[PDB]
Symmetry: D2
Subunit: 165 residues, 4 copies
């Protein structure tokens, strides 16, 4: 199916290809951030070898996923500066760490858009478990996916960054 | 020493931070693409643990370092004498340059600098080729992997040369 | 005072310079979108010749300036009391806010600041609407005009509100 | 024909739309920079109301364009750091200024790719005739079109910037 693109389109890739703006992206090995369409398309998830879905915008159900050997968890968060997502940094990060402990695992962290809530949980994960500063973490994720945590989530990540340092 | 920047500058990072325009960038684990300044600063290379330098602008008319320049430092050097010109056949160099990057990266301890004058065209082409040959990447995948870590733009001739390589490798991998 | 930067930083400008992430940006002639700091710095507004301030985060619970804040400065003020929330109906404000921007921009001498807290969502939405209503732009054209001068991202609700406006104006312009 | 795009695609526009990567773009009122396909598509140029083509990579011919009331000029430049494009800054800029003096005029400055040679002539134009520093000029053009003058052209523009200041 793939064919080598012509020059014009290769040049677009050098200029506009990165960070890519898509439904889902891998932001760290075996760790994907995506939107709702990606989480709901369960035939794609299973064929892509996915093993874990973390919904930072929990309704669908674990029965939707449990019929395919996918561990699900939903954090019931709103994408509003008045939601304290920091309440979930440690347990979401623990979920992600546990999943990535096994080599066979591939995890999708998602929300509606996959730009704010989910992004903030993966940032927190990288900080707590991969010894990253908030700046290093943002560089890791943002090069792979256009993300923008809301102003409140960002304040929360700054406070986590202060505690970790 | 590191402190958490304010909200305004963290935002800048989300909007403008990727790819960064800097002298050198890690574009694959232990694999850096840098410019001439980076190649020349020996204190800073040694402090960072570089074990290999591939100079994609080798020669007394280009970036005139060579193995002698890194004497006593414990660096292995590979030199490709190339011009950043669409008429220059960088493709004869693709496999052996890549083989040098691959032998370096077999050893966990190694850390390799591939540079030219700007580290945007010559060195970038060699690393794209490396990724295509040794990491099973299409030209597209390879560009995405590098462009997200470093601003690069190989010249039109180098691109066509990468395209000719890409077609072969794709054909080969149908198998 | 201004000097020509070196080659390396001029290159950065080509790769990373557009759009810039700054406090305020001109996004249409004499029309600026800025943040709260910009709205508050009166010395700097007056030095730059601002004649109009549209505060898209008006109110004592938001950016608490109002017309009194600009007393003696010769600024006309328009206040829209808005929350950056997808549930907030910014659309009732579209025509009269735009009418205020249009009356300012009729006079060559005028220079207008439209701001909110960050100048990314509330103020941006009002200016997109302005361009659509008074400069014959589609939502797409308006976004291209603003996004190339300022990093902006209206919230999902404001976007849907812009879409509802866009559909009407397009229908109207079939005529 | 136009229809209002859905949310996903509007959001791509906020993130990746600017600067746009296309065949041609307007970089200053009535002043377009484009590639060769745009210059050769003469039915499009005429319907778009174009009045002037400046080819910074002059072969096609003025007979190709003179059959449609388009003033043509070709600068025979190579996109190589060893080409001194500065020899043409004043007369190319004069051509552009003369064209833009009339309100009815719309000018296309082009080369093969429309990224280096043509870009450098429009930058020089903005500096010589619109009182811009090289930095202001780059901001004007780069927000409208992905451009990158070659390292030699850039050195030449720095030297022009020094002379003008």
């Amino acid at each position: 199916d793939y064919c080598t693109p012509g020059a014009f389109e290769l040049e677009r890739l050098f200029w506009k290809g990165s960070p890519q703006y898509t439904h889902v992206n891998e932001v760290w090995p075996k760790l994907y951030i995506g939107d709702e369409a990606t989480a709901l398309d369960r035939y794609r998830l299973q064929k892509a070898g996915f093993t874990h879905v973390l919904n930072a915008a929990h309704d669908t159900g674990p029965d939707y996923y449990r019929d395919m050997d996918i561990q699900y968890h939903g954090v019931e968060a709103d994408d509003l500066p008045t939601f304290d997502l920091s309440v979930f940094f440690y347990p979401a990060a623990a979920f992600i760490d546990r999943a990535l402990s096994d080599d066979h695992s591939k995890i999708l962290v998602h929300c509606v858009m996959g730009r704010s809530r989910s992004a903030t949980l993966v940032l927190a994960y990288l900080m707590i478990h991969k010894d990253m500063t908030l700046v290093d973490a943002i560089q890791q994720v943002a090069k792979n996916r256009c993300v923008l945590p809301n102003r409140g989530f960002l304040k929360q990540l700054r406070e986590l960054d202060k505690q970790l340092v």
